[PDB]
Design a protein around this ligand. Structure first.
Ligand SMILES: CCCCCCCCCCCCCCCC(=O)O
Ligand SMILES: CCCCCCCCCCCCCCCC(=O)O
Lengths: 129, 129
């Protein structure tokens, strides 16, 4: 019902392949590929504040679902996109050629980003505080 | 008696001045100055592993107190230094013209980095898992 929490990355698949596909340099990818950090979400109804840690980068994004917003991506590009809430537990959007689904089941977020044949999946667990 | 934990940045002083002094690109200073994320320490005796969130960057470092080590700074530069334990609750390192003191007070960690007349101070709080 609420996405709010601090989420510890537990495991991921295809980090290197996805970051290569979007244009990041190999040297940066290899430096970040094994980091398992903590991302944070604060949800207030349709409003979301994200402090995402992925690889060696921390990205802070904010949106209201259903409203267009500029989302900073791993390349540094700020993309214009609309994120929708499906049900109470799935955030969906598409930007460039990437389909993104952020799904909350209990205390586990599964984030799936699909770019052609590459399915980049991150599993993170809410720190219960 | 253990530094181990995940710590949420609560407040900080003179981020912009310190990052300017060490030469961080201005675009990264402006992006990173308001980000308050989670850093992790794993201590095993004199050995420490760090996953540090500072601004828009995540930095991993690892060393044994009392032994020379090579640590990655906020600019990405690698420096060789020996980290000491002071008074059983302070990690103290001096590299180039910076003195860094990481002090543990219960659930609070205070990182104080002194560079000439600038004191960059971070106060973080243990996440209770
Ligand atoms: C345009 C959207 C932002 C894209 C940023 C790319 C970094 C990977 C995104 C995964 C974060 C999704 C939130 C779940 C928590 C997590 O997996 O850290
Ligand atoms: C050897 C230099 C360390 C990395 C340089 C980044 C500047 C900030 C370092 C602060 C790390 C201290 C660890 C405790 C938690 C924190 O304050 O984030």
């Amino acid at each position: 019902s609420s996405f709010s929490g601090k989420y510890q990355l537990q495991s991921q698949e295809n980090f290197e392949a996805f970051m290569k596909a979007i244009g990041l340099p190999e040297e940066l990818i290899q430096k970040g590929k094994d980091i398992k950090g903590v991302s944070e979400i604060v949800q207030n109804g349709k409003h979301f504040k994200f402090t995402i840690t992925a690889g060696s980068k921390v990205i802070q994004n904010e949106f209201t679902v259903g409203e267009e917003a500029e989302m900073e991506t791993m390349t540094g590009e700020k993309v214009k996109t609309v994120v929708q809430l499906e049900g109470d537990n799935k955030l969906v959007t598409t930007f460039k050629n990437i389909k993104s689904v952020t799904e909350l089941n209990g205390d586990i977020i599964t984030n799936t980003m699909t770019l052609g044949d590459i399915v980049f999946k991150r599993i993170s667990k809410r720190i219960l505080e």
